[PDB]
Structure 1
Amino acid sequence: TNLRGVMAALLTPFDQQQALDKASLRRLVQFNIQQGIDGLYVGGSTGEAFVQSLSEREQVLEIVAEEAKGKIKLIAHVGCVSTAESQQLAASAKRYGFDAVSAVTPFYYPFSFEEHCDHYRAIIDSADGLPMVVYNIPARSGVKLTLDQINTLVTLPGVGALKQTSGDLYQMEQIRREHPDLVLYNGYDEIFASGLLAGADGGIGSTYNIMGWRYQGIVKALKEGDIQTAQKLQTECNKVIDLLIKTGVFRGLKTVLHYMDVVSVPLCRKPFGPVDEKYLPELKALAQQLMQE
């Protein structure tokens, strides 16, 4: 029932025709489980949910539950701009046995804060008992929540956690101060160590798919007062992030996983383009060093 921890934001493998690569998805789930990951955040931004249809997202949720249910925590990101579509995914997540649901603040169209609250309330209702993880990512959603609005969201009945994908660590601390028991996930992998120090008690990130144990290592180092190890691991994580940002994050991660024999075809769906070939050697070298870890 404890949602605290390090949860990888699962990527969605696609085959040559851009259809779901089921075999690769199953391999990826098993791969994450073997890294000692606490759970999987499925169908989020990282899973390329916004370039998938509802039935495609459901298929991914169903398959992941099959592979991981009862082995690790499973959080289903069911967010869509539409409340109705989000509720359908929420209902499916409950049906498949997920531990919790999550929804990004609905975007593109401007919605009032009250409309955002009602959107979450409606999804929580359809989640039929699964706790909700509010997902705040201003840089992508364009939705800028105030601390006060955040306080209201995380106290909504049915909400059990906040995925804070914001680099504002003053706000991270304020949220922790206001909610001592809240499950608070750091969302920007590149500041994970600093985010934990500011108050997060876990994290959800796309890079956990290829080096989740490093983040688990940061949590442990900070708990043990081993600052140096925490800083060294974060630095190694950031060297990797530097590269992934240059290559394109999702495509870069899938390419590394391809060289790790997990993903058959490392492509993202259009309009994402392929990785620039000039980066393949660094991505292959990265996969090699990670495998030897």
Structure 2
Amino acid sequence: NLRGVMAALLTPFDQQQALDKASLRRLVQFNIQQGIDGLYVGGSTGEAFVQSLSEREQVLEIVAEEAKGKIKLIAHVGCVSTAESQQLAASAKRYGFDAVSAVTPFYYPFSFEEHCDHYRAIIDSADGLPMVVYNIPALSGVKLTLDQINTLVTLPGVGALKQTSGDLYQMEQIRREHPDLVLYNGYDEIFASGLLAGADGGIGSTYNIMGWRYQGIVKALKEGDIQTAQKLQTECNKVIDLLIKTGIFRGLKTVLHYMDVISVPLCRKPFGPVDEKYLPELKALAQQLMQER
């Protein structure tokens, strides 16, 4: 079962921008400790697009060693290249992941038929692991229609869709057309509204520091406690407001650093460092979250 609240894992680096293995292991354990349902590895949040294939594989392997069998593991193996995506998919299979995922190939304009074959090829290489189609027009530049999304999610081997779109009319339409589809809400800031529209779970970057709040919104809605659902979403958004200002990945890494999880809060260039003017708020947030749970 792939339904649930899963954190989009960050990739800790050292001062020289190389993978910080110890911090990666610590972050995985930190997520498991807070009760996350699983981890989405190698996606935007893992800074996969500023990493080489071997580096992405290294992360996948380490995460599997740390969490396989404890929580669900989804490997984002997407690359612009189909061959590269297939290589990562085969590795994900070898490491024991529960599923693979791929963002619609970007930069170059590809036809819908080319997108479909891309997924089929990756699904083939995943050798049994279900595919999680990844729709994120804001970053990919690929704007799929409802009909195209319907076609992609019905491809043999596809078991879920990570929907990083704020269009909740489309979210409802997808649920209506696919009653049993695992549908992850992608934008943390509309989690509550996304679940109401039809999503049955979610994958997000901020889950790394406050995943319990999202689990709290799932519970609240399940119990009909709209008031609690809204309060939690509001608090999540006050945090997201900040992270968008500071830079999301580096902001999250900085909070995790103050929580003593990540040794060095750096992102790889061209991502710049956090503006020191935000440190007071990030430190205060880390303190608040540590007390909260």
Q: CA–CA distance in 2 between the matches of 1:27 and 1:114?
A: 41
Moved over 3 A (4+): none
Cα shift readout 1:181-201 (whole Å, capped 9, x = no counterpart): 000000000000000000000
Cα shift readout 1:37-67 (whole Å, capped 9, x = no counterpart): 0000000000000000000000000000000
Q: CA–CA distance in 2 between the matches of 1:281 and 1:130?
A: 44
CA RMSD of superposed structures (Å): 0.3
Asked if 1:290 corresponds to 2:289, the answer is: yes
CA shift, 1:152, in A, is: 0.2
Cα shift readout 1:215-235 (whole Å, capped 9, x = no counterpart): 000000000000000000000
Cα shift readout 1:76-111 (whole Å, capped 9, x = no counterpart): 000000000000000000000000000000000000
Asked if 1:57 corresponds to 2:56, the answer is: yes
Gaps of 5+ in 2: none
Hey, what does 1:279 align to over in structure 2? 278
CA shift, 1:289, in A, is: 0.4
* TM-score normalised over the length of structure 2: 0.99
Q: What secondary structure sits across from 1:223 in the alignment?
A: helix
Hey, what does 1:230 align to over in structure 2? 229
Q: CA–CA distance in 2 between the matches of 1:278 and 1:264?
A: 21
Hey, what does 2:46 align to over in structure 1? 47
Q: What secondary structure sits across from 2:264 in the alignment?
A: coil
Gaps of 5+ in 1: none
CA shift, 1:28, in A, is: 0.1
CA shift, 1:168, in A, is: 0.1
* TM-score normalised over the length of structure 1: 0.99
Q: CA–CA distance in 2 between the matches of 1:157 and 1:281?
A: 50
Cα shift readout 1:99-141 (whole Å, capped 9, x = no counterpart): 0000000000000000000000000000000000000000000
Cα shift readout 1:141-191 (whole Å, capped 9, x = no counterpart): 000000000000000000000000000000000000000000000000000
Q: CA–CA distance in 2 between the matches of 1:54 and 1:202?
A: 29
How many residue pairs end up in the alignment?
292
Q: CA–CA distance in 2 between the matches of 1:33 and 1:204?
A: 15
Q: What secondary structure sits across from 1:108 in the alignment?
A: coil
Q: CA–CA distance in 1 between the matches of 2:96 and 2:220?
A: 33
Q: Percent identity, please.
A: 99
Q: CA–CA distance in 1 between the matches of 2:64 and 2:227?
A: 37
Q: CA–CA distance in 2 between the matches of 1:34 and 1:193?
A: 23
